[PDB]
């Protein structure tokens, strides 16, 4: 179980396109203890590439996703954080410091340096996942440190650097959930840049 994500608490910062689908995938494989950190509301334009429906438009993205995740399986135990990272309350920061695997799905360079500046007070498995602007590629960074390596992650992103549809984001959600499960099964410093072709085939180039 030490190598099994189903027994790990998993915080997912960013309940948007990629993060909503990844969260749902994880819930369906058995990752019941999940946190979901997002402060923005779900918009009608988000639905073209999202896990939720019109019934969640206008509701906070984290709360709505958690309501959906808790309906997936009986033992689902998702929790919502309707604030931006880092929190302001000291109770909230302790709540986030209970999660084992912190998975950033925001695509925001500000969140990366916020993770590095946050004091996790213990070793965590950090995983940053983001796509290129037309979902032609997927940046997939991982680490197992007591502090997020922001300098190195940024370096590997910069070195690797039509509108994205639901089949573009779902493909990368699947790839990323398989990346997330490979990382928790063998934690370490890993970086991999994937590329999608017009027929849905995927190629990979890992960093050495």
């Amino acid at each position: 179980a030490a190598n099994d994500i189903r027994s790990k608490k998993v915080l997912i910062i960013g309940a948007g396109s990629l993060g909503s689908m990844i969260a749902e995938n994880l819930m369906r494989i058995g990752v019941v203890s999940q946190g979901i950190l997002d402060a923005d509301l779900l918009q009608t334009g988000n639905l073209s590439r999202h896990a939720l429906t019109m019934t969640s438009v206008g509701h906070n993205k984290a709360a709505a996703l958690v309501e959906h995740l808790n309906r997936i399986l009986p033992d689902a135990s998702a929790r919502s954080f309707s604030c931006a990272f880092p929190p302001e309350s000291e109770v909230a920061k302790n709540s986030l410091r209970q999660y084992d695997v912190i998975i950033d799905c925001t695509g925001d360079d500000g969140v990366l340096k916020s993770l590095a500046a946050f004091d996790w007070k213990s070793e965590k498995i950090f995983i940053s996942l983001a796509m290129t602007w037309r979902a032609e590629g997927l940046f997939a960074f991982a680490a197992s440190e007591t502090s997020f390596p922001v300098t190195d992650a940024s370096s590997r992103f910069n070195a690797s650097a039509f509108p994205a549809r639901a089949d573009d984001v779902q493909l990368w959600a699947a790839v990323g959930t398989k990346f997330i499960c490979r990382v928790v099964s063998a934690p370490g410093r890993i970086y991999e840049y994937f590329k999608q072709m017009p027929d849905g085939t995927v190629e990979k180039e890992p960093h050495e």
């Binding site: 695509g107 925001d108 796509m131």
Partner: peptide, 4 residues
């Protein structure tokens, strides 16, 4: 450059 990155979009989640």
């Amino acid at each position: 450059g990155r979009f989640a």
